[PDB]
Amino acid sequence: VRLYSCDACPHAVFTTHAALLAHAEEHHADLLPDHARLRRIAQKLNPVWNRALNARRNTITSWGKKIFHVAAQRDAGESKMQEAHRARAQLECVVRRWHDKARVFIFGSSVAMGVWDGTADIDFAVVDVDAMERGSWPPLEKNAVRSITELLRRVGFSFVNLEPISHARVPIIKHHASSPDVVARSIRFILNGPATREDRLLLEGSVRDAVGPTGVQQVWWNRTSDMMSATLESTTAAVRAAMCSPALASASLRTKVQPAHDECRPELYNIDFDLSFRAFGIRNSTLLRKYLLSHPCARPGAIVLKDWSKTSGVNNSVNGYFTSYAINIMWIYYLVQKGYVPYVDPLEIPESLVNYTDFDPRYTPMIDPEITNTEREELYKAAGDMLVGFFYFYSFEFDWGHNVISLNRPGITTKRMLGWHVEDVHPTRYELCIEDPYEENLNLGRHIGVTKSLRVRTELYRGLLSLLKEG
């Protein structure tokens, strides 16, 4: 026996879950207007579910085809992924000026999905692995945000694009890219006075030393010897050269540097990114990658569910619903429990970054470029079956009342196992429970109280019904 409280009014507490649910329906139908109705329609299909699957088999397969189409749009090919790799290397040049031993790791979707569409923002983590191993990373993050922001400004980033968020719970730098080849890898040094012949040789030497013996293609000075332009071998070498620290001969002669053109620039200038100083997302993303690569329909399904969850409102973290990360866990848990993919113990992914190699996320095509039409049709059928199965699983099979969506063990996780079978009554909620793989006692559904939970259940019924029809 325990207390249950409503999340839509301050004065409703009950001693049974049934009474809580009844109260949500009876007193807050305005907050969950479609729940009863969609549940009822879905409940009609349950007794004849296999017959429904059989009759709607063509439609389900067509949804499978659409799922792969949507997934294909997010796969912009290996060359596009390598643009992100180059941006990562450019950012690394910059942050090493602040802390020589820091390295840049990409995490998030390009790791988990093995593809990048060229528009999704990129997550960068900046970590000194030695320091992390000593228990001394990150340094004070507010200062790190400010230091790196200044370095980016000095290499040519505008305050219009750079958002330092030094006073957040996790301080980050957000880069907001504006919307709109030799120029892109060219830079310009502006001097505050005329350079002597010796000064000119020293600046060129500084650039040469920064990029190595192949890095500089061309250097030229203006008439008044107070601007030097350089074309480098790559966009990455261009950032590396911009990061040099010239030591000139003339007293007080100084330089400012920026890309030669305001719009045509190295990759880092052109991509939305969040820059953080913590390693947490790396292990996360690597675990998701391992699971999602283990069935050919896993990534396409995850992609369609991310979009579905956003449009249906169940993925909306600022208002306390799920994150895209949590939706990925729901999908993967379903794949594991139904036997579509093998279980992976979260502990199999090392916490330590000492042996890390994949700073640049490995590219894997969304669909095998060399499969037959027959194999492809089998994939569409499977994808449709699996997506329908996901909505069915969470609508009728998964015990939301007593169990937890968890990848921390291969068998059932009960709420009681985690101590989530009782709430301390904006409480931490245990209505819908998803265990975070690496952060113990964190429910990804902790902000989802009873009425919010029924909005979620509404959308699961809606998705189930949608896949059986023209949509």
Among ligand 2KH, Zn ion, none, what binds residue 286 when CB lies within 5 to 8 Å by partner kind? Answer: none
Element of type H or E holding 4: strand 4-5
Site string for ligand 2KH, 113-152 (x = CB under 6 A): ----------x-----------------------------
Q: Is 394 near ligand 2KH (CB under 6 A)?
A: no
SS3 of 127, please?
strand
To ligand 2KH, the closest distance from the beta carbon of 435 in angstroms equals 12
CA distance 145 to 164: 6
CA dihedral sign of residues 296, 299, 303, 308: positive
Q: Is 408 near ligand 2KH (CB under 6 A)?
A: no
Indicate the annotated binding residues. 6, 9, 23, 28, 109, 120-123, 169, 281-285, 306, 310, 324-325
Q: Is 132 near Zn ion (CB under 5 A)?
A: no
To ligand 2KH, the closest distance from the beta carbon of 26 in angstroms equals 33
In the bound state with Zn ion, the residue whose beta carbon lies nearer, of 21 and 417, is 21
In the bound state with ligand 2KH, the residue whose beta carbon lies nearer, of 1 and 318, is 318
Per CB under 5 A, the list member of 2, 3, 5, 8 interacting with Zn ion is 8
Residue in the block written with tokens 């699961």: 460
Q: Is 286 near ligand 2KH (CB under 6 A)?
A: no
To ligand 2KH, the closest distance from the beta carbon of 352 in angstroms equals 17
Q: For the chain, how many helices (H) and strands (E)?
A: 16, 13
**Token pair in block for residue 132:** 């992390």
Among ligand 2KH, Zn ion, none, what binds residue 131 when CB lies within 5 to 8 Å by partner kind? Answer: none
Q: Is 276 near ligand 2KH (CB under 6 A)?
A: no
In the bound state with Zn ion, the residue whose beta carbon lies nearer, of 33 and 194, is 33
In the bound state with ligand 2KH, the residue whose beta carbon lies nearer, of 286 and 395, is 286
Residues 6+ apart with CB under 8 A from 316: 310, 322
**Token pair in block for residue 121:** 């923002």
In the bound state with Zn ion, the residue whose beta carbon lies nearer, of 8 and 249, is 8
Indicate the annotated binding residues for RNA. 169
Per CB under 6 A, the list member of 280, 399, 425, 441 interacting with ligand 2KH is 280
Q: Is 450 near Zn ion (CB under 5 A)?
A: no
Give the residue closest to ligand 2KH by C-beta: 281
Q: Is 107 near ligand 2KH (CB under 6 A)?
A: yes
To ligand 2KH, the closest distance from the beta carbon of 307 in angstroms equals 10
CA distance 330 to 50: 23
To ligand 2KH, the closest distance from the beta carbon of 324 in angstroms equals 4
CA distance 325 to 310: 12
In the bound state with ligand 2KH, the residue whose beta carbon lies nearer, of 108 and 259, is 108
Q: Is 206 near ligand 2KH (CB under 6 A)?
A: no
Residues between 11 and 30 with contacts to Zn ion, criterion CB under 5 A: 12
CA 68 remoteness from chain centre? 20
Which residue, 145, 236, 228, is CA-closest to 185?
236
β-strands 186-191, 227-232: how paired?
Answer: antiparallel
Element of type H or E holding 135: none
Q: Is 112 near ligand 2KH (CB under 6 A)?
A: yes
Residues 6+ apart with CB under 8 A from 428: 443, 446
The answer to whether residues 71 and 249 touch, using CB atoms and an 8 Å cutoff, is no
Q: Is 220 near ligand 2KH (CB under 6 A)?
A: no
Among ligand 2KH, Zn ion, none, what binds residue 114 when CB lies within 5 to 8 Å by partner kind? Answer: none
The answer to whether residues 349 and 309 touch, using CB atoms and an 8 Å cutoff, is no
Residue in the block written with tokens 């009960």: 414
Buried/exposed code over 348-373 (b: 16+ C-beta within 10 A; e: otherwise): ebeeebeeeeebbbebbebbeeeeee
Binding piece for ligand 2KH, criterion CB under 6 A, among 85-93, 103-111, 350-358, 445-453: 103-111
* CB atoms inside a 10 Å sphere around CB 439: 10
Per CB under 6 A, the list member of 236, 284, 451, 453 interacting with ligand 2KH is 284
Buried/exposed code over 294-324 (b: 16+ C-beta within 10 A; e: otherwise): ebbbbbbbbbbbbebbeebebbeeeeebbbb
Indicate the annotated binding residues for UTP. 109, 120-123, 281-285, 306, 310, 324-325
Contacts with Zn ion, residue ranges (CB under 5 A):
6, 8-9, 12
Contacts with ligand 2KH, residue ranges (CB under 6 A):
107-109, 112, 123, 280-281, 284-285, 288, 323-325
